[PDB]
Design a protein around this ligand. Structure first.
Ligand SMILES: OC[C@H]1O[C@@H](SC[C@@H](O)Cn2cc(-c3cccc(F)c3)nn2)[C@H](O)[C@@H](n2cc(-c3cccc(F)c3)nn2)[C@H]1O
Length: 138
């Protein structure tokens, strides 16, 4: 494969028990990946693996409101590797997004944007070959 950046519409927004699955492969020498769950111009949930921030690998999560980034939430557990295939699963739960990578729980992100049914796009960006992006209800 899909063209990156990729826009996946989420019809009617998100809702608890919606599971979003992203399959791809990290490029060689990757620097960054981003998933952006968007409410119009706002980013309800930005999930941003950084492969070289001051020579460290870190996951940064944040929200962008009225074009302003908020307070970052950081996770140093880092399950991605340059050149390797991955699966990201984002399960919407009542009070947070729950993220697993390669079937292992990674992090939760509490809902800052609370109009879940207005979070109606997922952008997928950065240093990946994107194989598929889809959603289902569990
Ligand atoms: O906030 C999140 C934002 O970050 C900024 S970079 C600056 C901050 O990182 C500053 N900062 C440090 C800290 C902090 C807090 C505690 C400890 C600590 F060490 C540090 N708190 N704030 C970044 O451009 C943003 N962005 C990334 C992308 C993007 C586009 C395409 C592909 C892709 F993969 C990503 N588009 N926009 C977005 O990721």
């Amino acid at each position: 494969p899909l063209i990156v950046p990729y826009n996946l519409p989420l019809p009617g927004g998100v809702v608890p028990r919606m599971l979003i699955t992203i399959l791809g492969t990290v490029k060689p020498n990757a620097n960054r990946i981003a998933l952006d769950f968007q409410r119009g111009n706002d980013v309800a949930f930005h999930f941003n693996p950084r492969f070289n921030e001051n020579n460290r690998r870190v996951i940064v999560c944040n929200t962008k409101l009225d074009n302003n980034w908020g307070r970052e939430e950081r996770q140093s557990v880092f399950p991605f590797e340059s050149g390797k295939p991955f699966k990201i699963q984002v399960l919407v739960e009542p009070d947070h997004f729950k993220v697993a990578v390669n079937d292992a729980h990674l992090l939760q992100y509490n809902h800052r944007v609370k109009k879940l049914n207005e979070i109606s796009k997922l952008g997928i960006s950065g240093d990946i070959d994107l194989t598929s992006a889809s959603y289902t209800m569990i």
